[PDB]
Structure 1
Amino acid sequence: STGSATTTPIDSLDDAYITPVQIGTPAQTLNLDFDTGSSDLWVFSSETTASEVDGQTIYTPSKSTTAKLLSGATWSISYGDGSSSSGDVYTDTVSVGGLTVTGQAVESAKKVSSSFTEDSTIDGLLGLAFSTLNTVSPTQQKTFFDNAKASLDSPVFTADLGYHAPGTYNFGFIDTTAYTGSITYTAVSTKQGFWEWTSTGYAVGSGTFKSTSIDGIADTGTTLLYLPATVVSAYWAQVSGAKSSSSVGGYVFPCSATLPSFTFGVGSARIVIPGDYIDFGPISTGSSSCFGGIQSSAGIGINIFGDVALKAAFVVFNGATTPTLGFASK
């Protein structure tokens, strides 16, 4: 089997991407944030505290003939940005892009934090990290990809995120029309539950490539590129007037600037992030200070290749016996 679904930016900045997901029978279509940095499939639901719902589409298990309570199971998750959600669990049929999993754990939110409520465009998350990170207790649950994987033609999914445009998530096959050149594969550590890999270095603009190991995660659920402070300082030093602002919470730059590209290594290959991808626009409406798309990881504890980096590539999440990660230019 395979599946193929279009993923669409939620706003003009590509802050996140939503992908339609069919849950239940008859189908209830929710727009979920596919997150390779977490492992819970959770949704706004008929159980979500009413004051915490503002415009989201909700899953109503009582209207699904295939929904069953996963008796006694609860979940609770905290993300890197400080957001959180929790609730109880149903099993139901879940389809993505024509690929169906029966008996998928669908984590129904009873509570969500303010950042979720305030985003009407995201109806929940679909985690694609390793199932070892799933928060369901007392019986940990599998991701959609791990429930799908044996059924797939190949044990892979691919992320093809657009810059200010829709893109694609494919399951079970690699679309050889979707990238240019060849795919470079690189090893993955599952030790922390993530698609954790080591980049071979970086360049700023037209500068020389610096060979250096940077261990980080491929995380579709993080907007920005978070790298060591040395690397980030080297990048922003090439932008007149850029500075780190503790009041704003990271590097800002004059909106009049033209940003340099950023290159990261994948083995002997190179992925180039155009400068425009690193522009996240005014810090507040009408401001002439703009927020940078490359930020320091020094206050995280991990480097994160988020959407800024991933959208510059065709990315293969190879879930073979020994998982790996492929990158191609596009």
Structure 2
Amino acid sequence: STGSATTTPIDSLDDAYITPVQIGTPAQTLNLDFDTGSSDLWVFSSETTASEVDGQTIYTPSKSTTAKLLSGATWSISYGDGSSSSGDVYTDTVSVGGLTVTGQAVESAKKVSSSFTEDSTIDGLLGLAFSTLNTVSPTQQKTFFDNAKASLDSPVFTADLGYHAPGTYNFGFIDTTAYTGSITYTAVSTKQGFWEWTSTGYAVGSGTFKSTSIDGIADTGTTLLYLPATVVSAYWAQVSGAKSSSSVGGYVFPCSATLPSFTFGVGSARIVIPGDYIDFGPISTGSSSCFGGIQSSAGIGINIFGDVALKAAFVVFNGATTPTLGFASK
């Protein structure tokens, strides 16, 4: 089997991407944030504290003839950005772009933190990291991909995120028309439960490539590119007026600037992030100070190849017995 679904930026800055997901019978379609950095499929629901729901579409398990309460099961998750949610668990039928999993753990939120409430466009998350990170207790549950894998034509999914435009998540096949050149594959460590890999280096604009190993995670659920302070300083030094602002919480730059590109290495291959991808717009409405899309990972504890990086590539998440990651230009 295969599946193919369009993923759409939630706003004009590509702050996140949503993908429609069918849950239950009859189908209830919710727009989920596909997140290769976590492993829980959770949704706003009829069980969510009312004051914590503001415009989201909710899953109502009582209206699904295939929903079953998973007895005794609860979940609770805290993300790297300080947001959180928790609740109970149902199993139900879940379909993405024509690919159907029966008996999928659907984690129903009773509580969500303010940043989830405040974002009316995201109805929940669909985790695509390794199932070892799943938070369901006392019986850990499998991700959508893990449940689908055996039935897929090939045990892979691909992320093709657009810049200020829709893109695609495919399951079970590689669309050879969706990229240019070849896909370069690189090793993955699953020891932390993430799609963790090692970039071979970087370049700033038209500058020379610096060969240096940068370990980090391929994370569709993180907006920006978080890299070591040395690398980030080298980038922003090429933008006149750019500075790190502790009050704002990262590098800012004059909105009048033309940003240089940023290149990262995948083996001997190179992915080029155009400068415009690195502009996240005014820090507050009306400001002429703009927020940078490349930020320091210092004190995150990990480097994160988030949407800023991933959207410059066609990315293969190969979930074979020994997983790997593939990157192509597009």
Per the TM alignment, residue 268 of structure 1 is displaced from its structure 2 partner at its CA by: 0.1
1:253 shift after superposition:
0.2
Q: Aligned equivalents of 1:221 and 1:113: distance in 2?
A: 17
Deviations 1:94-135 (A, max 9, x none): 000000000000000000000000000000000000000000
Shift of 1:61: 0.2
The 1-side partners of 2:298 and 2:72 are apart by: 39
User: Post-superposition shift, 1:254?
Assistant: 0.3
CA distance in 2, matches of 1:300, 1:238: 24
User: Helix, strand or coil for the counterpart of 1:150?
Assistant: helix
Distance in 2 (CA, whole Å) between partners of 1:199 and 1:70 is: 41
Output the CA distance in 1 between the equivalents of 2:109 and 2:304: 26
Return the TM-score normalized by structure 1: 1.00
Aligned-partner Cα distance in 2 for 1:198–1:248: 30
SS at match of 1:126: strand
Over residues 2-55 of structure 1, what are the superposed CA-to-partner deviations in whole Å (9 max), with x where a residue is unaligned? 000000000000000000000000000000000000000000000000000000
Please list every run of at least 4 consecutive aligned residues from structure 1 whose deviation after the TM superposition is greater than 2 angstroms. none
Question: In the TM superposition, what whole-angstrom CA distance separates every residue of 1:38-76 from its partner, at most 9, and x where no partner exists?
Answer: 000000000000000000000000000000000000000
- Structure 2 match to 1:202: 202
Which residue of 2 is the match for residue 240 of structure 1?
A: 240
What displacement does 1:265 show? 0.1
Following superposition, the deviation at residue 180 of structure 1 comes to 0.2
In structure 2, C-alpha distance between the alignment counterparts of 1:202 and 1:234, rounded to whole Å? 10
Aligned to 1:78: 78
Aligned to 2:288: 288
% identical aligned pairs: 100
Once residues 193 and 18 of structure 2 are traced to their aligned partners in structure 1, the CA distance between those partners, rounded to angstroms, is 23
SS in 1 for 2:77: strand
**Per-residue deviation, residues 116-171 of structure 1 (Å, max 9, x unmatched):** 00000000000000000000000000000000000000000000000000000000
Query: Per the alignment, in what secondary structure is the counterpart of residue 276 of structure 1?
Result: helix
* Aligned partner of residue 182 in structure 2, secondary structure: coil
List per-residue Cα deviations over 1:287-307 (Å, max 9, x = no partner): 000000000000100000000
Once residues 288 and 57 of structure 1 are traced to their aligned partners in structure 2, the CA distance between those partners, rounded to angstroms, is 35
Partner secondary structure for residue 94 of structure 1 = strand
1:308 counterpart SS class = helix
Instruction: Give the paired residue count.
Output: 330
Per the alignment, residue 270 of structure 2 pairs with: 270
What's the secondary structure of 2:140's corresponding residue? coil
Aligned counterparts of 2:2 and 2:231: Cα–Cα separation in 1: 39
User: Are 1:120 and 2:120 matched, yes or no?
Assistant: yes
The alpha-carbon deviation at position 315 of structure 1 amounts to: 0.1
Question: 1:249-293 CA deviation, whole Å, 9 max, x = no partner?
Answer: 000000000000000000000000000000000000000000000
Aligned counterparts of 2:14 and 2:79: Cα–Cα separation in 1: 19
Residue 329 of structure 1 deviates from its aligned partner by 0.1
Name the SS for the 2:239 alignment partner: coil
Residues 186-214 of structure 1: per-residue CA shift (max 9 Å, x gap): 00000000000000000000000000000
Note the C-alpha offset of 1:221.
0.1
The whole-number CA distance in structure 2 between the counterparts of 1:46 and 1:153 is 35
CA distance in 2, matches of 1:295, 1:70: 41
Residues of 1 paired with 2:66 and 2:287: CA distance?
50
Take 2:6 and 2:81, find their aligned partners in 1: how far apart are those partners?
A: 25
Q: Which runs of 5+ in 2 are unaligned?
A: none
C-alpha distance in 2 between matches for 1:204 and 1:53: 43
SS of 2:277's partner is: helix
Q: Superposition RMSD on alpha carbons, in Å?
A: 0.2
Residue 279 of structure 2 corresponds to which residue in structure 1? 279
Q: Distance in 2 between matches of 1:74 and 1:267?
A: 41
- Counterpart CA distance in 1 for 2:165 and 2:78 is 29
**Equivalent residue of 2:232, what SS?**
helix
Give distance in 2, aligned partners of 1:232 and 1:126.
Answer: 30
- Structure 1 residue runs of 5 or longer lacking an equivalent are none
